[PDB]
Coordinates of N, CA and C and ligand atoms in Angstrom, one line a residue:
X1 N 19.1 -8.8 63.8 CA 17.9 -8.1 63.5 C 17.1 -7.7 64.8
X2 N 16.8 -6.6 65.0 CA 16.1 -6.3 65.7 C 14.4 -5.0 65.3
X3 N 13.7 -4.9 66.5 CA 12.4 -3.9 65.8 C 13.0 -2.7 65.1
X4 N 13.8 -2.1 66.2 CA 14.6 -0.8 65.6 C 15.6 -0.7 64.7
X5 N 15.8 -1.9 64.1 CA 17.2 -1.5 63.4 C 16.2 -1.9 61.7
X6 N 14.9 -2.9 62.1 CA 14.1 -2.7 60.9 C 13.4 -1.0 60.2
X7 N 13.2 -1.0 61.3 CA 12.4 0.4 61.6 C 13.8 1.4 60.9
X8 N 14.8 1.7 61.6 CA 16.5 2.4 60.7 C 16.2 2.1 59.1
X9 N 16.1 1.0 58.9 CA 16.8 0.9 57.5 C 15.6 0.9 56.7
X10 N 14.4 0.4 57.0 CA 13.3 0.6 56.5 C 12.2 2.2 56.2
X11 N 12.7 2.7 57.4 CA 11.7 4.0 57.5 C 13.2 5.2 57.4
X12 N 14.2 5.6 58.1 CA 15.2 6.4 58.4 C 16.3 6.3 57.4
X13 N 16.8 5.4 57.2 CA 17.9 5.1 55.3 C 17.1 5.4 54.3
X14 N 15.5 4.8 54.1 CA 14.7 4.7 53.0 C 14.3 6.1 52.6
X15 N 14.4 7.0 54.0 CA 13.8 7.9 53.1 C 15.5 9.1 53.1
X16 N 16.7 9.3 53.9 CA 17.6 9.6 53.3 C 18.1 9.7 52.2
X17 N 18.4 8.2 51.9 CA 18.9 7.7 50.8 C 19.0 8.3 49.7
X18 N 17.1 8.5 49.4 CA 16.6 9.1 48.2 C 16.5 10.5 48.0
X19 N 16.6 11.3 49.2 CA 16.6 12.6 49.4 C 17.5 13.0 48.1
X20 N 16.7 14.6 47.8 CA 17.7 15.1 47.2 C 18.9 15.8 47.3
X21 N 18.7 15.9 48.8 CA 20.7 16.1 49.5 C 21.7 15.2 49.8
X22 N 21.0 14.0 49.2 CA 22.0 13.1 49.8 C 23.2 12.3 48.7
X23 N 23.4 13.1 47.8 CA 24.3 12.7 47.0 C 25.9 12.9 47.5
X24 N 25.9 14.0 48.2 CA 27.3 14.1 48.2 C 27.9 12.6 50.0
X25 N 26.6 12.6 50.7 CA 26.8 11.4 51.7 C 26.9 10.2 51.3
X26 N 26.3 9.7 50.2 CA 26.1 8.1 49.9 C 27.4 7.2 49.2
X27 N 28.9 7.8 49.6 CA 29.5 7.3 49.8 C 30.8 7.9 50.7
X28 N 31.9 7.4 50.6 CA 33.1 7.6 51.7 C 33.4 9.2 51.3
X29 N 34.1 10.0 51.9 CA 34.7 11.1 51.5 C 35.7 10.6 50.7
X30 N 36.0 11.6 49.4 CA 37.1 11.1 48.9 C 37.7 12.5 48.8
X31 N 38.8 12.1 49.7 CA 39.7 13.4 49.6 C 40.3 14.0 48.6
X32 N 40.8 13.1 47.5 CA 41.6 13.1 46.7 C 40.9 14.2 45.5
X33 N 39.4 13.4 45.4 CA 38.8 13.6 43.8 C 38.3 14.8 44.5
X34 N 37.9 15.1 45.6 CA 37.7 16.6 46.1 C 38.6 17.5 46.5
X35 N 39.6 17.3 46.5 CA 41.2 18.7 46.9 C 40.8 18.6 47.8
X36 N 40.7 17.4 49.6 CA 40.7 18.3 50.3 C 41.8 17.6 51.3
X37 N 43.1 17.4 50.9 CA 44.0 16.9 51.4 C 44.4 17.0 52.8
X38 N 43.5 17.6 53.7 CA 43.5 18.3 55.0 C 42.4 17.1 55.5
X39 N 41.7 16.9 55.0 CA 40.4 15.9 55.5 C 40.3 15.2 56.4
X40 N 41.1 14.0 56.5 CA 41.5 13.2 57.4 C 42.6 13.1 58.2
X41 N 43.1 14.6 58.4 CA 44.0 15.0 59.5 C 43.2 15.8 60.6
X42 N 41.8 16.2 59.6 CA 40.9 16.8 61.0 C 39.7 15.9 61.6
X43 N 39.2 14.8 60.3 CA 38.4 14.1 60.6 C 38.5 12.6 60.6
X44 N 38.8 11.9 61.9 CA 39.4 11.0 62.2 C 38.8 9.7 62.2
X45 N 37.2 9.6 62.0 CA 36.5 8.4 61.7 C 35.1 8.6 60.5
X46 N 35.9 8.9 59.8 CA 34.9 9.0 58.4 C 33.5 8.0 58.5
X47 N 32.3 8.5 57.8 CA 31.0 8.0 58.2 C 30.5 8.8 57.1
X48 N 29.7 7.8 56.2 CA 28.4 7.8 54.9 C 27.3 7.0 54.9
X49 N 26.5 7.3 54.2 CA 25.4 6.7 54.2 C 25.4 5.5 53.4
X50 N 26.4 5.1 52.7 CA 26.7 3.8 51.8 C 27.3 2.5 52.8
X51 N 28.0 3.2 53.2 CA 28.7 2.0 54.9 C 27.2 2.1 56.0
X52 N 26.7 2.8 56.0 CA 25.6 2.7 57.1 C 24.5 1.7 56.4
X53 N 24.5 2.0 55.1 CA 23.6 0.7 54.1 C 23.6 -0.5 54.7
X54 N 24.9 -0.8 53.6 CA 25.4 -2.2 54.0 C 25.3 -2.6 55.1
X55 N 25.9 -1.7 56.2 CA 26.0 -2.3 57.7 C 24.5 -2.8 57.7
X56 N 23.6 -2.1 57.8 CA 21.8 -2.6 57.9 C 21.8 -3.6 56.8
X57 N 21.8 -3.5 55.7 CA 22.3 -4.7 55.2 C 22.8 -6.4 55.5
X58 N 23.9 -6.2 55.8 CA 24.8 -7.4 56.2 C 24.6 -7.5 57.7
X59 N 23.4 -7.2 58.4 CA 23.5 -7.5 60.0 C 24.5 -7.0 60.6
X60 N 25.6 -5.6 60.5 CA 26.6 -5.4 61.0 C 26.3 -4.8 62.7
X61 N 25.1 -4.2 62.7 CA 24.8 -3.9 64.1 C 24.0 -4.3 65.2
X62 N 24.2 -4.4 66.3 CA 23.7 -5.2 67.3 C 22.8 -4.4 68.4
X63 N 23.2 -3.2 68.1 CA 21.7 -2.1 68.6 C 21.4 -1.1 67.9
X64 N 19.9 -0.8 68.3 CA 19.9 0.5 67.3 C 21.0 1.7 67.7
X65 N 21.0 1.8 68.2 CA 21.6 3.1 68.9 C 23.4 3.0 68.4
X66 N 23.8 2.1 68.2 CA 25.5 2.3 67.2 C 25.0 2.7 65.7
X67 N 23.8 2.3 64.9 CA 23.5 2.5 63.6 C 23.1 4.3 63.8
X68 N 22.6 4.4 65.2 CA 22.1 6.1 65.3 C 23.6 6.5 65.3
X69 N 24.6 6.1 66.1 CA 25.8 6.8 66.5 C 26.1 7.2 65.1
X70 N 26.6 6.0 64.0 CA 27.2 6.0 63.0 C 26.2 7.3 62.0
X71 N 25.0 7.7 61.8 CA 24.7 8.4 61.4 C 24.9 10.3 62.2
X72 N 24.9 10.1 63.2 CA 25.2 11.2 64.1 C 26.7 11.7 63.5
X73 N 28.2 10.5 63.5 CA 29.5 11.2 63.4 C 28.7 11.8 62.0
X74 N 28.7 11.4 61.2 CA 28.3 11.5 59.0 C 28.3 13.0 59.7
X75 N 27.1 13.5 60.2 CA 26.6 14.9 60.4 C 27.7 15.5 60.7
X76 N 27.6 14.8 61.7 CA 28.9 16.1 63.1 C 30.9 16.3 62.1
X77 N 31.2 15.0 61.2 CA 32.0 15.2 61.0 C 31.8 16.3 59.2
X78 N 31.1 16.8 59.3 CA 30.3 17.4 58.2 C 30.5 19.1 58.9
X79 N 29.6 18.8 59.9 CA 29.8 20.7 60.7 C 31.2 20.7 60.8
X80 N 32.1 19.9 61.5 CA 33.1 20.2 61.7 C 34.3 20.6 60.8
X81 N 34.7 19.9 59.5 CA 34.7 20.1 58.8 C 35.0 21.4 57.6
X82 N 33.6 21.5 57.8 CA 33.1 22.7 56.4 C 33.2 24.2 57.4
X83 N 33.4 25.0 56.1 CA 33.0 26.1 56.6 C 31.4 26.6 57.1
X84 N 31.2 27.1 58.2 CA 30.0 27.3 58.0 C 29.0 27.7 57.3
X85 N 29.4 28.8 56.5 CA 28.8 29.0 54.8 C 28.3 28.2 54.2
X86 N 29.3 26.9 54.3 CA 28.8 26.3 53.1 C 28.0 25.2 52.9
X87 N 27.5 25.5 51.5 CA 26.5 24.6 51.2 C 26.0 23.2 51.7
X88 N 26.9 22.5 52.0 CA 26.6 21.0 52.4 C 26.2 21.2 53.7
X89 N 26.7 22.1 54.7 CA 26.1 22.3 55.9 C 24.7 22.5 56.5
X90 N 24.0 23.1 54.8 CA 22.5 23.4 55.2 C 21.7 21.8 54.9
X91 N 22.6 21.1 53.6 CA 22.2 19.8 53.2 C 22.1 19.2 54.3
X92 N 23.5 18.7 55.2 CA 23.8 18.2 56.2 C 22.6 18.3 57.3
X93 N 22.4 19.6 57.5 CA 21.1 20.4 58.6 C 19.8 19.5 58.5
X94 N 19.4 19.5 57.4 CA 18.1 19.0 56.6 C 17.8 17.8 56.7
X95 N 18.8 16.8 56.2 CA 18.8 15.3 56.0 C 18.9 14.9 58.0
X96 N 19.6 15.7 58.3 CA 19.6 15.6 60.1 C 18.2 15.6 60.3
X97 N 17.6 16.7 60.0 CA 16.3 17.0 60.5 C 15.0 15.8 60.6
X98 N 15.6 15.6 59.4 CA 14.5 14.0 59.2 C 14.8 12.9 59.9
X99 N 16.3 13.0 60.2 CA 17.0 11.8 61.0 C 16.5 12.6 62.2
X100 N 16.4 13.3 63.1 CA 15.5 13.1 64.1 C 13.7 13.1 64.1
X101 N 13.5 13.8 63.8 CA 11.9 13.7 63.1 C 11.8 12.0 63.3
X102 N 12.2 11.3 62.2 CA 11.9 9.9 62.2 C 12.2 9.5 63.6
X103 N 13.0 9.3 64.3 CA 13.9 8.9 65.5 C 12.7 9.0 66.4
X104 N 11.9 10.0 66.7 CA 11.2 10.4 67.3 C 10.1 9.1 67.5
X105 N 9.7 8.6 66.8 CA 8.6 8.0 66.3 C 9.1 6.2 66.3
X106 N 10.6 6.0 66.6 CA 10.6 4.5 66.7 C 10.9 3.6 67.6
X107 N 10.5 2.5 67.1 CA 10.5 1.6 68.6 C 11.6 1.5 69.7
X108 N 10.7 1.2 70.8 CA 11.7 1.1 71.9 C 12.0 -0.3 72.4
X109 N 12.8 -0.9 72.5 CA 13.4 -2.8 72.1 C 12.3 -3.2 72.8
Ligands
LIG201 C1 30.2 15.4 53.0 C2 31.3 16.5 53.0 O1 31.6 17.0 54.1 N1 31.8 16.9 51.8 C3 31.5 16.4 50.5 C4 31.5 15.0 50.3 C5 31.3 14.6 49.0 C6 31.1 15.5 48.0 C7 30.9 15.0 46.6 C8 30.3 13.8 46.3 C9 30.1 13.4 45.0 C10 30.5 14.2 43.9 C11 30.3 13.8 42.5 N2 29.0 14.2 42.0 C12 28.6 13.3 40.9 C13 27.1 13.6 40.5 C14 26.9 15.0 40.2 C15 27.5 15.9 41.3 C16 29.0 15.5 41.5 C17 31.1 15.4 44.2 C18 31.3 15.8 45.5 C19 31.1 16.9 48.3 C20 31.3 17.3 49.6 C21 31.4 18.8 49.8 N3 31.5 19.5 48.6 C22 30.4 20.0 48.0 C23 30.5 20.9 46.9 C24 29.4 21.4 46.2 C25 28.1 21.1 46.6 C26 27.9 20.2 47.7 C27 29.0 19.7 48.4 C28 32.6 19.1 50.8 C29 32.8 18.1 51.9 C30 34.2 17.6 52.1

């Protein structure tokens, strides 16, 4: 436990979480139940907001800044991914937006 990783899961998950874009993040990609059988031959370390839970959860991280990393791939392997068009990329955009917004504003160790 540290200031920042209270501050992560308290103020930056709490308010993700609930967002109304964050349904399709709050767990693993599933290739299968989505056709996208390509998925994990382009995206090679899958990242959600359900493993980033837990991790704050279960004391999985030891600085803030791996819990930021781990929210950074979710996004980036999101742009990468998708077509630009599409929809989840503006979700994606948005739920980022707050994830630095908040970032901005939290403690330094
Ligand atoms: C996070 C991500 O990159 N993806 C992802 C990851 C997960 C899901 C996803 C997650 C859960 C469900 C099941 N939902 C149950 C509640 C009601 C909506 C369906 C369906 C798709 C979708 C998606 C994206 N598809 C999509 C389609 C229409 C609108 C928004 C996004 C493509 C893409 C592979």
């Amino acid at each position: 436990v540290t200031n920042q990783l209270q501050y992560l899961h308290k103020v930056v998950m709490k308010a993700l979480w609930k967002h109304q874009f964050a349904w399709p993040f709050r767990q693993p990609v599933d290739a299968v139940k989505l056709g996208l059988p390509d998925y994990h031959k382009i995206i090679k370390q899958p990242m959600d907001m359900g493993t980033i839970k837990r991790r704050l959860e279960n004391n999985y991280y030891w600085a803030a800044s791996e819990c930021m990393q781990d929210f950074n791939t979710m996004f980036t392997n999101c742009y990468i991914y998708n077509k630009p068009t599409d929809d989840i990329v503006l979700m994606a955009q948005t739920l980022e937006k707050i994830f630095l917004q908040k970032v901005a504003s939290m403690p330094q160790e």
